[model samples]
Target: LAINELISDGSVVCAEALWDHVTMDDQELGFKAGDVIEVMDATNREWWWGRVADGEGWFPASFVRLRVNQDAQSSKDQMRTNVINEILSTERDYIKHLRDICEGYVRQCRKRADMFSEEQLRTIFGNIEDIYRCQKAFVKALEQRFNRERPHLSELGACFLEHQADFQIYSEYCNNHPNACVELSRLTKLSKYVYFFEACRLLQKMIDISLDGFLLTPVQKICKYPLQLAELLKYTHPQHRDFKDVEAALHAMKNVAQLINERKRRLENIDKIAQWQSSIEDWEGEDLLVRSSELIYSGELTRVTQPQAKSQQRMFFLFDHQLIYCKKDLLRRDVLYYKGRLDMDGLEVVIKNAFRLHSHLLCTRKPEQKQRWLKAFAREREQVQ
Candidate 1:
């Protein structure tokens, strides 16, 4: 009867033989399932920390698996709910706002640069640089916000506002207990999507500006702005933060930085960019600009573009030779049609291919051919060429 009572499903068990084997003195023999043993008898009466049978003690409850009681089950459920709600609430409230605030701050810096001379430009840009450091914290905040810790929104949202919720849990609780609600009648709203689109749009604008000036500058600056911006967005942007997207974005960011280093700089403020790139030890940016140009030409406009073909064309020509060849009448034609789809698909393919090949072609091809190819494939160039 005692054996049947103790051996319930999910209850832990010990072996009699194991107990005997451990003891140099005991003569215990065969073992059976469902035998309870005491691991530590110091705890309490009938606690059954371990199993004892056939004159030996065997499986201890510490190692013994058991089904949780009702109270324990409730606790586990509460914890699970807490974790899920935390993520949903975080995505709804703080993440989007943080991104918006940062982008807004950076945009203001760029605008300030326009009116200011080099000194003012550097000052503004320097502040812009803080956004990079701050971004690390910003991303960390979002990840924790999703995991049920205090999101510290008050600090992160100092420059911006949190999202509005259609309904709050506290308000519902208040309806049940009006007196209890006296303390507060507001809590987080459940189920909402933070408008990450706005954040992406704002960031896209900055990416376009850097892309326009991409070729003219020394290597190391090409993808610096956009990749850094993307780094900031990686955690804030829900879709981009997952294991896969984040992994790809990080890899891409490193690649862009590498390309900038290898492409050769114009010797203008090259030291600043070189210093930054060296901090990471990556040397893989062979084709990022080529990629960016392709993105621009394919209408992958982020916030920085106003949809003008002239600006698009200008940026298109900014890439080194590989990108130019990809734009050439015949080469571009082959590239665009490489996988079929005469229009958008073709153009998209060409743009991506240019980026992929930019690094290789940039290092070897003659300077004169590079210029010729670019002009010949230039917006005004004849299709027949």
Candidate 2:
């Protein structure tokens, strides 16, 4: 069930001494930062999940622990987020540069195609495609990092907002029960859970809002762009330089050139094209389904075929749904007038309404049943149609 997976998914990083003597078995996993555990009776329901490690895993109803201190979990979660955002933001800039160089190379080759035989042209284009594939893996890694990071940030905020009373109550209990080490550990785990807990709850939302879901080219959305770009961002901070340290970043990205080449060749093949089309149809539905709104290009221009064109992927956040375009110029890049307004509060209302609609199916009375719900959520089967 969802609770079981949430419990096991979070790893244990306890000291060996504690593992052998005091903490034994699952009860003594000594949940560390990044572990997820559960909170029993958290919702007055038979079972529910609570994230531990500030926001990493979900523990089942029985495993949930309670902690004391408002700023306890908040401190850890915020530090984790500050670390991620700083690192990710810098890396994001470098990724932008890598795309620029690779796309630039592609364009130059395409422009001079008249100079080479078809086979040679194919080889070059095929190489270009390889770059795209390899980059996707790294992009996925960065997204994972972001996924882990974003929730911690939210959990830290929520800890402050949602757990002041719980902390006070638990702290009072601890003051009176000096010998209750069990109680103390319970408080600690609970405190950690509050920081990144809600983020675990919202995982479905993140997966649903993926870049592909936004309709953008995978190649243009990743990190591993090149070491130079990362170095530049790392060292220069606010100072901008032309083609600065981007070469190193680009070179690093090409480290996976083998994978890229393989993927591009596969994708460029006629059969691959058919599969890609099929996949798109399965997800987006047949016929040209227009996005309910626009997806903004948070990414940047990387390289592409001739004219050394820089590519910017577009994302559309429709009132009720989100969509993405592979390139800014899709449909001439001018998506109709783009005049729809959903305020922040209104959007929250919509999402809450959506979650409430799916709550029954999301909740579970048993571990197996809870996991079934987890699977459904992951597969996007439980979302509003």
Candidate 3:
């Protein structure tokens, strides 16, 4: 769709700029073609106050068009109405989708009895059930607000701000049991059933879009409101009552988004740690510490057992609590044998011909890598202690 056709009254738009210009404000806002901008005040005929990714300023009305739609009559009101509609529409489909999974996969799996462990079933169904229930209330609240003649968007924003944490139940479960997420992928097989095959296929698609997918839409839906509100705020004057409410809502949503991102990062780090741990063997007494550890650096290096011993190729991993090195098994190419590791508490780095991690000396073929590893280890070690 044309940018003008796609955007409503107060929504954000892409400036298919005919010419580029910098802002005249205290901070110059430079933009070229295909820049996404919010129409802050298009009420002025020739010039419009807009906010770009960088900063807010006035742009020539001739230079931009509506990329998303809202009523020019009451842009803010139109935006609120549109957002509520979008949320309601998506939420309806989403709830139906979860119910289908609950009926088709989760319920059917229960009937089979031997198919998956009760704990596993709970891990899979529990998350979806929680989201479905929570979002049902969320959708209800939004609908109630929308039914009013003049809806308060701040109320809608406040509604999300209040309930955003509730969405984390799914991601948190998946994060804690990384194996459960893997099991979920395996169990979502379409090849296993006749009547249930179609259901499985549909469920798989839902998983691919929901928390199981990269889009993280279950939680992301909450984050989207703040961004939309931020854009809408540009159109609102600071003196307006709705302005403060919108700003406050934006702040709340940003906090929720930040929490979500942090949760995602921690989960990802745990996954990486698990993968690395699985690749190695014979390392003992440190797994507990590893679960809570942060990976600082990892690289390939050669280790010398003694001063003039043969250099063995090893994979080095530095974590907040420990440093571990593993040598690839000559007979089993895919397997790695744990050589040794040092606790970060008493760790020391010595650099010259080789970088020594306490008593064990290791060297990189490149001098730069040695210096980099040395400096990085010391920096992380200091932080760890």
Candidate 4:
């Protein structure tokens, strides 16, 4: 229900087509690259029907990037110029913080490899040096061109686009961060390792920060790039030589940003699931919950039949494609007893507030709950296709 608001939170402006297209039917719009298309409706994500040239019809989102230019800053404000330097300044800072980890902490960790397990060492530094080396060149690309070309910059995006492949490693690095911190403090007892870290921090000229703090810079920069580029885009004109490259560059990083955040969601959600699995009594077939699934809705349901035995309360856990029913542990309200698994393909809501799978009937607490169950099955039906 809340999704509608965000879908069209703001609407004003035009989009420039990035490619040419021919009409597929009467409802489809056709346009060539570089044509200025006025955005009329944005309610649909993939296809937005907007005025193109003299006519209007639906256009693919992939075919254009939103082009916006407003405010007196179109002539360039003193403050707008500040954004340009901010991009270069932050980048100059970003590169060194990477050095703080590469030369500062990782170097020390590798030299003392004997003190840590090979597995621990790997987690502590996951292809970070590779990423650092790439950034070293990226910053080089930024500065080398900026010094000569000055503010009439045309290459802001070229640097980002070129390093897209190299930047892919951050997903792995970000995924390893939690484990890295665990292993770091895992040796908090040892004065030797503690001393090692303190020395690296001091040598790197970092004031009272740990390796984790330095490691997080890249992850944080993942968001920083898109924001800075967005600000850059907001300040740019379509006529500006740097506009298209920066737009493409911004698009490149959003995917990285999207993936890393998705990575974070998956790790914690999966961790929570594993922990939830432990509380359940006699959780047979450890295989089921461990294969990366969501505990969509898990609560009490009155088992309408034995589920093959006697009628009682059952707990249900739903996945996008799979659903299962379990018996509850008598002593622990939160804990579940392992029961037979049922695939959703065989599920049906035969009675109000109650559902049946292969003749096993289960009832929910309220009609509202029943409707929700029905909706969930309906949702499963659509996506399950």
Using lDDT as the measure, which candidate wins? 4
lDDT of each: 0.29, 0.31, 0.58, 0.66
How does model 2 fare in lDDT?
0.31
Q: On a 0 to 100 scale, what is the lDDT of residue 376 in model 3?
A: 62
lDDT tens digits by residue: candidate 1, 275-349:
322432223444333222221111111111224423222112222122221121343322211111112112211
The residue pairs found clashing in candidate 4 are 306-309
TM-score of 1: 0.17
Residue 55 deviation, candidate 1, in Å? 67
| Residue pairs in collision within model 3 | 3-66, 7-67, 7-68, 7-69, 8-68, 8-69, 8-70, 9-69, 9-70, 9-71
lDDT of 4 by residue, 159-226 (tens): 77788887788888888888877887777768988787787777778745556667667766764566
Report the lDDT tens digits of candidate 2 across residue range 164-267.
Answer: 23222222222222223333344336645333323432532332232112212223222122222233233332322322333334344434422432343332
Per-residue lDDT over 1-385 for candidate 3, one digit per residue giving the tens place of the 0 to 100 score: 3334334444445533422343212222435433566665655565766776435666766444342334354866676556545556667766666666666566667877666678777765556667777878887776765656654343455565567577556556434445545666675553563445455556555444333542133444543444555655665556655566667777876665556545654565676577757656786656824434466666677777785777777877777767777777779756777778766666566533443444666787777777768776877867665
* Model 2 TM-score relative to the real fold: 0.19
RMSD per candidate (Å) reads 28.9, 26.7, 13.6, 13.4
Q: Supply every candidate's count of residue pairs whose N, Cα or C atoms clash at under 3 angstroms.
A: 18, 45, 10, 1
Q: What's the TM-score of each model vs. the native?
A: 0.17, 0.19, 0.48, 0.55
Best model per TM-score: 4
Using TM-score as the yardstick, the better of models 3 and 4 is: 4
Native-to-model Cα distance after best TM-score fit, residue 34 in candidate 4, in Å? 27
lDDT of 2 at 264: 31
